[PDB]
Amino acid sequence: LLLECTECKRRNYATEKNKRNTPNKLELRKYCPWCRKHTVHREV
Amino acid sequence: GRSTTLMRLPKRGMQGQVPGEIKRPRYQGVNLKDLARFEGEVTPELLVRAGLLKKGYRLKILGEGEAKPLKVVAHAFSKSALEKLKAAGGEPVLLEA
Amino acid sequence: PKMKTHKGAKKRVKITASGKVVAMKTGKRHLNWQKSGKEIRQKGRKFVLAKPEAERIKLLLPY
Amino acid sequence: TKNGRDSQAKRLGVKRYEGQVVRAGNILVRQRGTRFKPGKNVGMGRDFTLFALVDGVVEFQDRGRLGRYVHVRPLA
RNA sequence: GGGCAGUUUGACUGGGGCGGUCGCCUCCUAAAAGGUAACGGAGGCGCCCAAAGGUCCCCUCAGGCGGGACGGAAAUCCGCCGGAGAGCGCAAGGGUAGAAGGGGGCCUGACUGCGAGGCCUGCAAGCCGAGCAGGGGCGAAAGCCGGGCCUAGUGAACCGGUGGU
RNA sequence: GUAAGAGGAGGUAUAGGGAGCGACGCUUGCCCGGUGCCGGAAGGUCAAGGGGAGGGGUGCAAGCCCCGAACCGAAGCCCCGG
RNA sequence: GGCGUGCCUAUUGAAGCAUGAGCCGGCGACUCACGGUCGUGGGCGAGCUUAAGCCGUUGAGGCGGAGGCGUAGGGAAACCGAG
RNA sequence: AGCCAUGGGGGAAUCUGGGCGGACCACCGCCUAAGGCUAAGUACUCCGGGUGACCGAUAGCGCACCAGUACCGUGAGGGAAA
RNA sequence: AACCUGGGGAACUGAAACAUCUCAGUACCCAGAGGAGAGGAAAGAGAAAUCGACUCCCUGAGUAGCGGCGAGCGAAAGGGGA
Numbered sequence: 001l002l003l004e005c006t007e008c009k010r011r012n013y014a015t016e017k018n019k020r021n022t023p024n025k026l027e028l029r030k031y032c033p034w035c036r037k038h039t040v041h042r043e044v
Numbered sequence: 045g046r047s048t049t050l051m052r053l054p055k056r057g058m059q060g061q062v063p064g065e066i067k068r069p070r071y072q073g074v075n076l077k078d079l080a081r082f083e084g085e086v087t088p089e090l091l092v093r094a095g096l097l098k099k100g101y102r103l104k105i106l107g108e109g110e111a112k113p114l115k116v117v118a119h120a121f122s123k124s125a126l127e128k129l130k131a132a133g134g135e136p137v138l139l140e141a
Numbered sequence: 142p143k144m145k146t147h148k149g150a151k152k153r154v155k156i157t158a159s160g161k162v163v164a165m166k167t168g169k170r171h172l173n174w175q176k177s178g179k180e181i182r183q184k185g186r187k188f189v190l191a192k193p194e195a196e197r198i199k200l201l202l203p204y
Numbered sequence: 205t206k207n208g209r210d211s212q213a214k215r216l217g218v219k220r221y222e223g224q225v226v227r228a229g230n231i232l233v234r235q236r237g238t239r240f241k242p243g244k245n246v247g248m249g250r251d252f253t254l255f256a257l258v259d260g261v262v263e264f265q266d267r268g269r270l271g272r273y274v275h276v277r278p279l280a
Numbered sequence: 281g282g283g284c285a286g287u288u289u290g291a292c293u294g295g296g297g298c299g300g301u302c303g304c305c306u307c308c309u310a311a312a313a314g315g316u317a318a319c320g321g322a323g324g325c326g327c328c329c330a331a332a333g334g335u336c337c338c339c340u341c342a343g344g345c346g347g348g349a350c351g352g353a354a355a356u357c358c359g360c361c362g363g364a365g366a367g368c369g370c371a372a373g374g375g376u377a378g379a380a381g382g383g384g385g386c387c388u389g390a391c392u393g394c395g396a397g398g399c400c401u402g403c404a405a406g407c408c409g410a411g412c413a414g415g416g417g418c419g420a421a422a423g424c425c426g427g428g429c430c431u432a433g434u435g436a437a438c439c440g441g442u443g444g445u
Numbered sequence: 446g447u448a449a450g451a452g453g454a455g456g457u458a459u460a461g462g463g464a465g466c467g468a469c470g471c472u473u474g475c476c477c478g479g480u481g482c483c484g485g486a487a488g489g490u491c492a493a494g495g496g497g498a499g500g501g502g503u504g505c506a507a508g509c510c511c512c513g514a515a516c517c518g519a520a521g522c523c524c525c526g527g
Numbered sequence: 528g529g530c531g532u533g534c535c536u537a538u539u540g541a542a543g544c545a546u547g548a549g550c551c552g553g554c555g556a557c558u559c560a561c562g563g564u565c566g567u568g569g570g571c572g573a574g575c576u577u578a579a580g581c582c583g584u585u586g587a588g589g590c591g592g593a594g595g596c597g598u599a600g601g602g603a604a605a606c607c608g609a610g
Numbered sequence: 611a612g613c614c615a616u617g618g619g620g621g622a623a624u625c626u627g628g629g630c631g632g633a634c635c636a637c638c639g640c641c642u643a644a645g646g647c648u649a650a651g652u653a654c655u656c657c658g659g660g661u662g663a664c665c666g667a668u669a670g671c672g673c674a675c676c677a678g679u680a681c682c683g684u685g686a687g688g689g690a691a692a
Numbered sequence: 693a694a695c696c697u698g699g700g701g702a703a704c705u706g707a708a709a710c711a712u713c714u715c716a717g718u719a720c721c722c723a724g725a726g727g728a729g730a731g732g733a734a735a736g737a738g739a740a741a742u743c744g745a746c747u748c749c750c751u752g753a754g755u756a757g758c759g760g761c762g763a764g765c766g767a768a769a770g771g772g773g774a
């Protein structure tokens with residue numbers, strides 16, 4: 001299952017790969033956008 | 045009969061639209077070095093008949109060259125050449141456009 | 142009678158000032174999915190070819 | 205006849221021998237595991253690739269129970 | 281809607297067909313650098329993991345023998361022996377306990393912008409990478425972090441979808 | 446045959462076209478699930494077209510222009526039989 | 528007396544029992560146009576050159592700068608510029 | 611995907627009218643559809659002339675000559691030599 | 693004879709297969725015009741508040757652009773001339 005981490009207070013993205021059924025319903029790991037600097041990211 | 049090397053890819057986006065080719069002002073670059081060649085009050089008029097502009101229209105003096113003291117009308121100037129040309133003369137910008 | 146410039150080339154290769162010929166790195170529009178961040182940054186640049194690079198030029202000339 | 209098959213042979217081995225001049229970054233050994241270990245001025249990448257950290261000559265060394273090491277004794 | 285029309289219906293192959301095979305990784309063939317063929321000998325891959333990742337701290341196997349209530353060849357515990365024959369998600373190989381293996385704390389560098397110098401190489405690709413800047417993680421610190429012990433887990437261009445500038 | 450028309454036929458189901466079998470004799474069994482053809486005013490699917498909830502572009506504006514849901518739409522296909 | 532396996536073609540290999548030719552004469556096959564690329568002989572030179580056409584000739588040349596290439600590159604572009 | 615043209619359907623206005631400047635709208639401009647005619651510059655070479663770093667009877671037009679003939683073919687057509 | 697306008701209009705071939713595309717509006721069939729034919733007095737061009745019927749040459753230009761963005765196709769304004 002493919003995944004792209006959207007940023008909060010924005011709309012950035014990042015290359016990724018969820019895992020769905022295996023314990024993974026909430027993906028919210030950190031990242032770092034070029035716009036601004038350093039922010040938390042959702043799943044989506 | 046395999047793939048050419050045409051496996052490469054057109055980054056050259058903005059390549060064409062139906063009516064295509066939007067007419068716009070063509071600026072031609074000309075340095076102070078070939079500008080110092082002569083002297084008086086250089087203008088688009090001189091430069092075309094000089095063999096440097098060739099009706100390419102729109103003139104922008106720029107960069108590499110030793111600023112010969114004199115007046116010089118043009119449609120644009122390089123920040124760099126603008127300062128050199130101020131350090132030994134004066135020059136007005138294009139007409140309307 | 143009067144060679145036609147190859148548009149496929151013109152549309153995706155630029156011939157440099159010294160003679161070299163450049164174009165974008167391959168594989169970058171959809172191959173990814175999570176491929177290293179290092180990958181896509183280096184796939185972002187453009188490069189020089191060599192022998193086809195000389196084959197390339199022939200396809201232009203008026204250009 | 206389920207055979208007749210293989211895989212593109214990776215040209216791996218010692219890429220720079222002892223008593224050779226190397227520039228910083230030069231790959232010294234491409235290896236399967238740690239058939240050679242790093243050492244003075246020689247770091248290795250995620251694949252085990254040993255490479256020079258600075259310019260200089262390359263010198264090998266062995267240490268039995270401790271294994272073999274590649275070095276780069278600089279001087280320039 | 282073969283009444284009619286234009287076409288397609290692959291290659292390898294001790295002739296062609298039937299059969300089998302077509303890309304990638306491991307080993308042998310391979311003649312002690314690299315590389316090397318055959319419809320030669322053997323196997324695998326088209327995934328998986330938010331912990332199976334980062335860091336800091338700690339621990340060390342398999343097996344054998346002796347002893348223990350359920351247990352019995354084997355569950356759990358004690359003792360002595362045991363240097364790696366275990367483990368390392370999966371094939372083989374190389375590597376490895378002076379950790380890459382097992383357990384825990386905190387964390388998300390499975391970062392952004394780059395990238396000296398090289399391995400491999402017909403092209404295109406593929407691989408390694410110190411270091412600089414930004415903003416961070418773990419550690420007292422020296423430091424380590426641009427996913428996973430590594431080598432498979434993949435697809436030029438073209439055409440279009442989606443989000444942004 | 447593009448058509449006008451012509452053949453069928455200046456014939457009319459005891460006639461005409463297509464198909465199979467092939468004097469004559471005794472006969473021609475079972476299977477309709479698939480395929481074909483025949484029947485079926487239901488229903489399901491369906492094109493243009495009708496409709497127009499709602500949405501967008503532009504203009505100060507009256508407007509102009511565009512996108513577009515529900516619902517109503519034939520043969521065919523599905524489905525029910527022979 | 529010594530020595531001695533036609534010619535061509537095609538081939539790993541031909542005197543070959545592989546191809547072509549009865550013999551002679553004549554006909555018979557890498558061209559031209561335009562556009563490139565390199566070399567070369569010259570003219571000019573940060574410049575070089577005209578095209579159609581016009582005037583002139585009747586195997587005579589000249590005029591014609593519209594235009595083309597070069598003197599600036601980088602960028603998809605807006606733009607900037609020895610960057 | 612405008613513009614020009616038009617097979618089918620709906621179907622105006624007469625200058626405060628209409629068409630166009632690449633969907634569409636506003637602004638700014640250009641032009642007057644649904645009637646027709648017009649020389650020159652241009653193309654060709656059956657015919658006449660002139661000229662060739664064009665051929666010289668296997669060349670040159672197929673034909674230097676009583677040749678589109680003889681001869682071949684039902685015919686269209688083929689087609690010499692000299 | 694060829695040249696010209698119009699009504700119809702192929703395929704081999706190229707894409708190293710082939711179907712879009714190409715060859716090509718070419719071959720050819722037909723109708724018509726004349727020493728020429730066609731075109732022709734802007735419901736034009738398209739960015740200059742610019743040009744001012746048409747035709748033909750040079751150029752712009754292998755540009756703009758078209759294109760299984762493959763093979764390949766390929767303008768116009770403007771400028772120099774008749």
Ligand SMILES: [Mg+2]
Nearest residue numbers: 001002019020
């Ligand atoms: Mg999955």
Ligand SMILES: [Mg+2]
Nearest residue numbers: 001002017327
């Ligand atoms: Mg998957």
Ligand SMILES: [Mg+2]
Nearest residue numbers: 017018019329
């Ligand atoms: Mg995962």
Ligand SMILES: [Mg+2]
Nearest residue numbers: 030031032391
């Ligand atoms: Mg991250």
Ligand SMILES: [Mg+2]
Nearest residue numbers: 033034035445
């Ligand atoms: Mg950015």
Ligand SMILES: [Mg+2]
Nearest residue numbers: 045046047048
């Ligand atoms: Mg292929």
Ligand SMILES: [Mg+2]
Nearest residue numbers: 064065066067
């Ligand atoms: Mg334009």
Ligand SMILES: [Mg+2]
Nearest residue numbers: 068069070071
């Ligand atoms: Mg501009």
Ligand SMILES: [Mg+2]
Nearest residue numbers: 071072073600
């Ligand atoms: Mg420029």
Ligand SMILES: [Mg+2]
Nearest residue numbers: 120121122123
């Ligand atoms: Mg400036």
Ligand SMILES: [Mg+2]
Nearest residue numbers: 142143561562
């Ligand atoms: Mg030409």
Ligand SMILES: [Mg+2]
Nearest residue numbers: 146147148149
């Ligand atoms: Mg092309």
Ligand SMILES: [Mg+2]
Nearest residue numbers: 053169170171
């Ligand atoms: Mg792409």
Ligand SMILES: [Mg+2]
Nearest residue numbers: 170171440441
């Ligand atoms: Mg895209």
Ligand SMILES: [Mg+2]
Nearest residue numbers: 002003173174
């Ligand atoms: Mg995907």
Ligand SMILES: [Mg+2]
Nearest residue numbers: 181182183185
């Ligand atoms: Mg990038």
